[PDB]
Design a protein around this ligand. Structure first.
Ligand SMILES: *[C@H]1[C@H](O)[C@@H](O)[C@H](O[C@H]2O[C@H](CO)[C@@H](O)[C@H](O)[C@H]2O)[C@@H](CO)[C@@H]1OS(=O)(=O)O
Ligand SMILES: *[C@@H]1O[C@H](CO)[C@@H](O)[C@H](O)[C@H]1NC(C)=O
Ligand SMILES: [Ca+2]
Length: 476
């Protein structure tokens, strides 16, 4: 599927090992500190697609599928998929080639997309760099395919960032020499044939800043689908230029101020407001970025605060910002694990309740986004506009005049006071009825064009014209 096709999608990101077992158990042990395979599979995902689609996601992102180093290392198993050895075999822990094809087909029957995580930068190996037997790597079965062994120490030296190895002396990540035509040609053939064998709709490309930029146009073209890159840097002047070589990147620039704004009742709305406007202006296309606050490489949102109002607001922002929403399996059950491995909790241990507070919030927010997109072909290309901020509030507008979603978010938290915010710049006409689609109340635009927004409980407010909701299932 093309970049234009992906703009309307909403992604549920999951670890194949951690989301759902074939046996469907909600009690099978998964101690994250053991760092071992817990037994999640592709078949398990298929069996729980109603759970994912019930929150109004249109797509899933799954962790890498290639065969891995076999060892239980000092840091545990390759459960996560980022330690590959044989790129032409699958990780048998997750199932068979027919199971991965059955997952793609099950998503397609539901009108959903499959996105697969891929690594081009590195293989994995149990042990020090000097102990590597290069013959285990397929097809790269020679030291001749790799950069000489060194670690990245100077992260300001972009040459060192690209040419030296990730990992450490315990688990090494042998660095492919992606400047070699033979390495480019194998990777380009591989990614095209992976996409066509498993009918994959899009790719999440890990580790993009560790491979020189001239590799990536050819890779994105060989894949034949939308690619979103992991460029792990909060500076839009570093990260956004990668969109000149790849369709999209993960929005790490928004990540840091978004987390800061909502993790505390003292968070900076100014930093978030300013970063939205920096990304909108200075990134090649904000509408092809991926918005997130939670992943398997940072502490979960609830590890910073268990306030459920704050969690509702940050989830609403993720769904209503420019670009593709990305929610990490467990976020919807308010999982609170810290840094790796504590943030790789099994989703099944929640019991997959569809009545939890954040399942309902995310369902409500995806519902209005999906509905608005179905009625407004300009929604996804209208650049999100922050129209108001104060010490505890940000408000933003997105969509075609007359059909715009106007979102008011707060960091007051669950003990926030009850008051009316008089909101200017929403763009609706005097006397217009709006539905607040999270709580299903109505507000009326005043003769002056200001919206009197009832604020209470620190709750997020998402406004849409009541007249435009004719025939939707929203706030029935
Ligand atoms: C990207 C991927 O998103 C990230 O999770 C990868 O980390 C993996 O490997 C490290 C190092 O061995 C483990 O500590 C971790 O548990 C495991 O998930 C990462 C490195 O392989 C990927 O690349 S990047 O370093 O983020 O660029
Ligand atoms: C896809 O299948 C083809 C034909 O059997 C094969 O040549 C190729 O290696 C496969 N690619 C992958 C990534 O498995
Ligand atoms: Ca590299």
């Amino acid at each position: 599927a093309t970049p234009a096709d992906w703009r309307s999608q909403s992604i549920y990101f999951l670890l194949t090992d951690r989301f759902a077992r074939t046996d469907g158990s909600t009690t099978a042990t998964c101690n994250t500190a053991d760092q071992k395979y817990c037994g999640g599979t592709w078949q398990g995902i298929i069996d729980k697609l109603d759970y994912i689609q019930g929150m109004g996601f249109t797509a899933i992102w799954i962790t890498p599928v290639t065969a891995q180093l076999p060892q239980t290392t000092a840091y545990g198993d390759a459960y996560h998929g980022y330690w590959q050895q044989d790129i032409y075999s699958l990780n048998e822990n997750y199932g068979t080639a027919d199971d991965l094809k059955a997952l793609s087909s099950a998503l397609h029957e539901r009108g959903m997309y499959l996105m697969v995580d891929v690594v081009a930068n590195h293989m994995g190996y149990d042990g020090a760099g000097s102990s590597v037997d290069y013959s285990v790597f397929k097809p790269f079965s020679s030291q001749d395919y790799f950069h000489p062994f060194c670690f990245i120490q100077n992260y300001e030296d972009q040459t060192q960032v690209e040419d030296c190895w990730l990992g450490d002396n315990t688990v090494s990540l042998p660095d492919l020499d992606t400047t070699k035509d033979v390495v480019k040609n194998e990777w380009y053939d591989w990614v095209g044939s992976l996409v066509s064998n498993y009918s994959i709709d899009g790719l999440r490309i890990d580790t993009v800043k560790h491979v020189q930029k001239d590799f990536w146009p050819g890779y994105n073209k060989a894949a034949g689908v939308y690619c979103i890159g992991e460029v792990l840097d909060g500076d839009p002047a570093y990260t956004c230029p990668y969109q000149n070589v790849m369709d999209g990147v993960l929005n790490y620039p928004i990540y840091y101020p978004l987390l800061n704004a909502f993790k505390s009742t003292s968070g900076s709305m100014d930093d978030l407001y300013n970063m939205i406007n920096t990304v909108k202006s200075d990134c090649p296309d904000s509408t092809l970025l991926g918005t997130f606050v939670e992943n398997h490489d940072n502490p979960r949102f609830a590890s910073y605060t268990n306030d459920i109002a704050l969690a509702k607001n940050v989830a609403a922002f993720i769904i209503l910002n420019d670009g593709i929403p990305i929610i990490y399996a467990g976020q919807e059950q308010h999982y609170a694990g810290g840094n790796d491995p504590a943030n790789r909790e099994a989703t099944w241990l929640s019991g997959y309740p569809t009545d939890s507070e954040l399942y309902k919030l995310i369902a409500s927010a995806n519902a209005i986004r999906n509905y608005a997109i179905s009625k407004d072909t300009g929604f996804v290309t209208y650049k999100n506009w922050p129209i108001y901020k104060d010490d505890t509030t940000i408000a933003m507008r997105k969509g075609t005049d007359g059909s715009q979603i106007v979102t008011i978010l707060s960091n007051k938290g669950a003990s926030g006071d009850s008051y009316t915010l008089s909101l200017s710049g929403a763009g609706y006409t005097a006397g217009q009825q709006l539905t607040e689609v999270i709580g299903c109340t109505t507000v009326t635009v005043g003769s002056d064009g200001n919206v009197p927004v009832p604020m209470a409980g620190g709750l997020p407010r998402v406004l849409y014209p009541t007249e435009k909701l004719a025939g939707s299932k929203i706030c029935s």
